[PDB]
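ok new one. same drill as before - structure tokens go in, u give me an amino acid for every spot. 246 of them this time. try not to just spam alanines like last time pls lmao
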């Protein structure tokens, strides 16, 4: 289980929470020195539980699928809430079985459906650690419109920060002030499967990508990633989505 408490949270303890989250995800192989996540894990062993405590010390417990870092649902007080999709429903068989009631959220867990329900695209939703604090507080008292925007903050400050060191950095910069994500953060979020597939395919091709991935960089310009020598590969991506699961 990993745990983060926002009271006392500073860029450094956050950096540490994100290092422990990565560290808690099982892998048997490293492809180009990046952890390759497992193709499947069975049952209960498929879910990591994160305890998040907001500044006032209230907690929600989020269940994450360890094969692809997907947030499946969460428990607030005595109620579990799960995304409306098959994988979240399978997850309910193993986690939060102690909750007095189980509520299925009107939407599934991907960004398209969540932005529709929340009302804004995520490039207009400020993220940071004050926004994570706010998100926890929202999720404690059900409201499904408000839960959609809070869950967009929650995904980006935990699962997306574990996947890319750049997003973790970005959230460390927003430790005392929220700010909308750069377009580089949106691009990276959207490319994880692609990037993961081509680094794994690069293995039998001299570290060269069979199809290059285009990203927006820091300075907002289009940039083609073509082999594993790239800074995106050497420094930025931290966990690889197994090809079996793409
Ligand atoms: N529900 C989710 N959990 C983690 N990463 C995601 N990316 C998009 N939706 C996500």
């Amino acid at each position: 289980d990993v745990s983060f408490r926002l009271s006392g949270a500073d860029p450094r303890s956050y950096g540490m929470f994100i290092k422990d989250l990565r560290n808690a995800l099982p892998f048997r192989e490293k492809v180009y020195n990046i952890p390759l996540l497992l193709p499947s894990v069975s049952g209960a062993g498929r879910y990591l539980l994160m305890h998040l405590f907001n500044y006032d010390g209230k907690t929600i417990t989020v269940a994450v699928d360890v094969t692809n870092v997907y947030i499946m649902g969460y428990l607030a007080d005595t109620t579990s809430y799960f995304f409306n999709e098959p994988a979240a429903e399978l997850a309910s068989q193993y986690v939060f079985r102690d909750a007095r009631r189980k509520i299925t959220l009107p939407y599934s867990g991907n960004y398209e459906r969540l932005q529709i329900a929340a009302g804004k695209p995520r490039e207009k939703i400020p993220i940071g650690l004050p926004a994570l604090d706010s998100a926890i507080s929202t999720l404690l008292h059900y409201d499904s419109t408000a839960a959609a925007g809070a869950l967009l903050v929650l995904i980006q400050t935990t699962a997306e920060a574990a996947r890319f060191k750049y997003i973790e950095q970005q959230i460390q910069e927003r430790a005392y002030r929220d700010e909308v994500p750069s377009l580089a953060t949106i691009s990276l979020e959207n490319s994880w499967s692609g990037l993961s597939k081509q680094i794994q395919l690069a293995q039998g091709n001299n570290g060269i990508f069979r199809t290059p991935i285009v990203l927006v960089d820091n300075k907002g310009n289009r940039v083609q990633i073509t082999n594993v020598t790239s800074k995106v590969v050497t420094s930025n991506i931290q966990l690889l989505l197994n090809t079996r699961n793409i």
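The beta strands are 2-5, 27-31, 34-37, 47-53, 59-65, 70-76, 79-82, 101-104, 208-216, 222-227. and btw Residues 69-71, 109-111, 155, 159 surround adenine (CB under 6 Å).
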